[PDB]
Amino acid sequence: VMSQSPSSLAVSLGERITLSCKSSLTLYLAWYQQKPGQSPKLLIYSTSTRESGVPDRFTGSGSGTDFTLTISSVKAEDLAVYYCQQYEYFGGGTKLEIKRTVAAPSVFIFPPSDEQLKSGTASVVCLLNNFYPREAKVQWKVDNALQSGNSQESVTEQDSKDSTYSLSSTLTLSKADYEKHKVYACEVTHQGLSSPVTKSFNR
Amino acid sequence: QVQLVQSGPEVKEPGASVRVSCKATGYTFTDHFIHWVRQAPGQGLDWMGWINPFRGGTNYPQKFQGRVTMTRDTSFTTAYMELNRLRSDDTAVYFCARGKNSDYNWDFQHWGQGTLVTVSSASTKGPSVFPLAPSGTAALGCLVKDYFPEPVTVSWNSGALTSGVHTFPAVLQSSGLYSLSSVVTVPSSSLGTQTYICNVNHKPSNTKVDKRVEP
């Protein structure tokens, strides 16, 4: 098994970044760069050789079972996942993301539409818009009863412009179960908030 | 140029088989091994084995040995990867790959575009589209609920509204159907006057829906 640490890393444009890969030997190393929806692209092979057209701000090094990929000055087009590879084995990868200032979620709640209720289902959407960093906690409360197991979350990739993330949480009930209660609330916890934010409505 | 072009997306039930094809052009086909690498959703790269098109000889990793079968058709310059007795965590994008040089097999300079294989017993179903109505910036959206398989596409106002749009990755529900939200933030003063319509395409079902989103 090969390993890369850390799994993700917040970087600032222009700074010097070092990505690490740990191998094991019982029988040299390549690096790939992958952006969303594309196939990986070979960057380094033979531990240190640059693939044709790779900028020389990328350097591969390696000693024993320890390999590094250094970017002397990270550029916007370097934001991607990097994988190391040795024969049949791949590291788990390291995603680069842009470090920016903390940004609190802007939180919005959406009751179920009448059109959905008419179909027999009720989904309540809690939208957490344009926050940073990615880590945030959504907690649904129904008539002040904390919920668990009846919601799912989805997060966008970092935005290209403002480097924020957005997150949706969707609480999904039956219509009969939704109609049994009054107060629907989503509570949001995040680093840019001094105390948790709650968005609620009475159906 | 070396070009590897793969077949289109597949949907298979658990226990079935899928066969993915990789057409290789722009070089002497029998001079290089063809590899197969897969990547489950949000996961890393996983090498599945290689074939030597010269006489069809193969090697597979232990994690797949009895389950994957690679073949080639030299006259059609195409490698094939068949994965049998499919399970849900075989859901993944499958790549064929080719090394930089006959010397070193493992420098994967060339990659196919990838083939998405979805393993599920769910049945093809178009989405229902419900409005996320807005309540000096407002949020509105569309809930694209209960569809199979991926993907759907969403635009707003026929592609004219793009700023502030967030279309989320779909979530897999316990039912085996997918569900997705798309939201957009707009000036609240535009709420009464400017119309906001989400356009949802689900081609596997030939579903096209427009939903006007009103206060």
Residue numbers in the entry:
A (entry chain B): 3 to 27, 27A, 27B, 32 to 207
B (entry chain A): 1 to 52, 52A, 53 to 82, 82A, 82B, 82C, 83 to 100, 100A, ...
The authors write:
Antibodies in this class are all derived from the pairing of VH1-2*02 heavy chains (HCs) with a limited number of light chains (LCs) expressing rare five-amino acid (5-aa) CDRL3s. Contrary to most other anti-CD4-BS antibodies, they recognize the CD4-BS primarily through their gene-encoded CDRH2 domains, although their CDRH3s also contribute to this interaction.
Importantly, 8–24 neutralized eight of nine heterologous N276Q viruses when produced in 293S/GnTI− cells. Only mAbs 8–24 and 8–27 neutralized the 426c.WT virus when produced in 293S/GnTI− cells (but not in 293T cells), where glVRC01 did not neutralize either version of the 426c.WT virus.
